Symmetry: C2
Subunit: 160 residues, 2 copies
């Protein structure tokens, strides 16, 4: 690590004997837990995607200029949530660096674990959109999906 120093701080370093250093820092990792909810399971999932993007920027500044569709499937609801968010992340990450202003989950097939969703927004841009934090990956850790009245989900994402 190197820090930005004031001259006074520099003066202090110069004034005392140097410290021999034999260490290094490895594998810095960071995450945050998203907690989303709604009146339906669909809404809980869509709100979780919007939480993820809401970490990257103020999605209120994102103009609803294009629409992108994300459909996916899973072996159970956790798996489905995982793949849903992953596919949305990938849309942002690769190809068009698309950021939705909003996401709407049109359906979740609760018997076969399929989902259809759509989001509207535009290509992300440092001049247009405020800088939040980049999201690196979705994880299964402490993933919970509560499919009950006023459904909720808890997901942990790896951030930079």
């Amino acid at each position: 690590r190197d820090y930005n120093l004031t001259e006074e701080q520099k003066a202090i370093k110069a004034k005392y004997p140097p410290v021999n250093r034999k260490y290094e820092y490895l594998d810095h990792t960071a995450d945050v837990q998203l907690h989303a909810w709604g009146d339906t399971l669909e809404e809980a999932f869509e709100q979780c995607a919007m939480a993820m993007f809401g970490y990257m920027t103020d999605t209120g500044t994102v103009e609803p200029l294009q629409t992108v569709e994300v459909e996916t499937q899973g072996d159970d609801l956790q798996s489905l949530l995982f793949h849903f968010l992953d596919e949305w992340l990938y849309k942002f990450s690769a190809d068009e660096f698309f950021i939705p202003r909003e996401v709407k989950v049109l359906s979740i097939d609760q018997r076969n674990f399929k989902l259809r969703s759509i989001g509207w927004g535009e290509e992300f841009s440092l001049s247009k959109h405020p800088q939040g934090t980049e999201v690196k990956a979705i994880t299964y850790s402490a993933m919970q999906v509560y499919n009950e009245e006023n459904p909720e989900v808890f997901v942990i994402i790896d951030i930079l």
Copy 2:
């Protein structure tokens, strides 16, 4: 939340607002310290120094006073754990002491106890650059290698 420009605030008020039903909880972070030395004592002191080095530039810490940390454990791993933990406590509790340097006087490898000292001063953002706060020591993937080239790996929780 975000600090917006005038253009960005227009865009925001131009469109229907988004109804949000989510919150962010439990942000966590960690980093793995890797330190080494001529001796196990050096490797241990270096590990403590690495921890403090993540909080600030320790070259900017003046050596105005000296503090002792003696501890004990049930093995080398718990010894290292307690050592870093007591040093973190010194910083985090009572006077906010940060050492510029730490020296491990001895490690008893038979009975797992050690004596160490550090020299420095009270930490202030008036004087010292801002690094990252250290929250706790963990045992995750803790490694102590004690052959030629003693070295240790310790994960700490941060921010």
